[PDB]
Amino acid sequence: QVQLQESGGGLVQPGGSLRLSCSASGFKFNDSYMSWVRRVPGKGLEWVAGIWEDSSAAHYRDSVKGRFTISRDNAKNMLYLQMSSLKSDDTGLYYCVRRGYSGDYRPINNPSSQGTQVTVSSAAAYP
Amino acid sequence: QSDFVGQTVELGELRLRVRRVLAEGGFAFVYEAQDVGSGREYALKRLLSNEEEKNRAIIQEVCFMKKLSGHPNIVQFCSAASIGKEESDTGQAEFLLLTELCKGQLVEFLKKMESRGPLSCDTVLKIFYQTCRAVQHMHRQKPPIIHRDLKVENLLLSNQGTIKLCDFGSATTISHYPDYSWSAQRRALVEEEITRNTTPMYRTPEIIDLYSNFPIGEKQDIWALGCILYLLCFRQHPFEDGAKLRIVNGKYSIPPHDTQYTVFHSLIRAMLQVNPEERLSIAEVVHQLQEIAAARNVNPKSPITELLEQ
Ligand SMILES: O=C1Nc2ccccc2/C1=C1/Nc2ccccc2/C1=N\OCC[C@@H](O)CO
């Protein structure tokens, strides 16, 4: 069966940067359109970025345009998200899923994986 | 048809990659299409025919969809195209419909739930309320649009997990009011067009008996909705054997020893009235479902998450 594992999330200052990582197994990755999605408390799921199976196209939600960069390594079955110039609106649980979105940035597939927590705060340590 | 996968369809400013087949229903195919520039996913319905009667029926259906779009329970219309007989590869006139992408068919979701047992009352209320809410939007049009083919098979589950009406192939704005001025010729030609556009077990008393002076209008959808609510509650369709004598005489029975869907019993009886004029209006049905939902503290517009997560 399908397996997705995220990493790279953490507590970073506004204006900061992070690199998220996603490992896929259980399906033909080289042929799947892959997406980065986030769960935000009091909001729900929102689609963030997506990339074509061969990387010939990368798509982004307007709020992350010019700040985020989605990439993939079909050889190592890895998916990445370079986040920069981070905002508090970027705080959430980030997951990586197959396929794109429908209508108002709503993912086709709901995440089954653990996800990785991105917290855009100045706090010394986690609360 | 199957070979149309891997294609890059242009519909306005959109450039849809045809990804995979979702459904096949005669002369039409349903595919999962994805915009190459945005990543937004859609449903693409393809129809190949050179028959003028079909071309005219596609125009009507698409015109109803354009008008009904925007209701939370009507499938959202995005764009459509009609490529000519010469202008297509197949040599047939090509009809393309682009809508919002739904999770799947309601029928395939209920088939997975039967293993888990009978549906909860709250699940039934949401499925039913959202369906009636779609029909209400239709009957509210000027002129009213009568579906004529309401059944669980024509119901999809949206991305959010809400009911979506997708097919309007049998819908009409034409009501009939049979009289003591109608010929056998008229009666049979009327009976002919309605048999083609209905599911036999979902056929109404007013279309089985064209010698009752029962009007043939929006009340047809109420009878079909009475059948749906019976089907969701109990295992089977109230007239699954498709017997004309049972349908025309209203001979069905609510399971004598049920204590789970009692809340809906009154409504089933009120909707499955033999005379259409003695049947509830869609507004009365919606109002009664709203009260049931209120006395239970359920928002009936809510996602049917009981189906979705499996
Ligand atoms: O959006 C969709 N996601 C799906 C997943 C599985 C099967 C079908 C569909 C589907 C459909 N989206 C649309 C939009 C307009 C018309 C038909 C239609 C669809 N499927 O139709 C299949 C059942 C239908 O033939 C019942 O009348």
Residue numbers in the entry:
A (entry chain C): 1 to 9, 11 to 34, 39 to 63, 66 to 72, 74 to 110, 111A, 111B, 111E, ...
B (entry chain A): 25 to 334
Pull verbatim passages from the article behind this deposition.
GAK (cyclin G-associated kinase) is a member of the NAK (numb-associated kinase) family, which in humans also includes STK16 (serine/threonine kinase 16)/MPSK1 (myristoylated and palmitoylated serine/threonine kinase 1), AAK1 (adaptor-associated kinase 1) and BIKE [BMP2 (bone morphogenetic protein 2)-inducible kinase]. GAK was originally identified as an association partner of cyclin G and CDK5 (cyclin-dependent kinase 5). It is essential for clathrin trafficking, mediating binding of clathrin to the plasma membrane and the trans-Golgi network, and regulating receptor signalling by influencing trafficking downstream of clathrin-coated vesicles. In addition to its role in the cytoplasm, GAK has important functions in the nucleus. It is required for the maintenance of proper centrosome maturation and progression through mitosis. Overall, GAK adopts the typical bi-lobal kinase architecture with most of the structural elements characteristic of kinases in both the N- and C-lobes highly maintained.
The asymmetric unit of the primitive monoclinic P21 crystals of GAK–NbGAK_1 contained two molecules of the complex, whereas the GAK–NbGAK_4 complex crystals exhibited a C-centred monoclinic C2 lattice comprising only one complex in the asymmetric unit. Although NbGAK_1 binds to the N-lobe, in particular β1, β2, β3, L23 loop and the hinge, the αH and αI helices are the regions in the C-lobe that are recognized by NbGAK_4. In contrast, a near complete kinase molecule (residues 25–334) was seen in the GAK–NbGAK_1 structure revealing that the structure of the folded form of the activation segment was reminiscent of the unusual activation loop architecture described for MPSK1. In contrast, although containing two molecules of the complex in the asymmetric unit, the limited intermolecular contacts suggest that the GAK–NbGAK_1 complex depicts the kinase in its monomeric active form. In this monomer, no activation segment exchange between the two kinase molecules is observed, and the activation segments of both kinase molecules are fully ordered, a particularly interesting feature discussed below. The structural changes are characterized by a major positional shift of the entire activation segment with a swing towards the C-lobe inducing an ordering of helix αG and the entire activation segment itself. The C-terminus of the activation loop thereby adopts a unique α-helix, a structural feature that has been predicted to be conserved within the NAK family. Interestingly, GAK mimics these interactions with a stretch of acidic residues in ASCH, in particular the central Glu217, which forms a salt bridge with the HRD motif Arg172 explaining why GAK is constitutively active and does not require phosphorylation of its activation segment. Interestingly, the indirubin E804 complex exhibits two binding modes which can be explained by the near-symmetrical core scaffold.
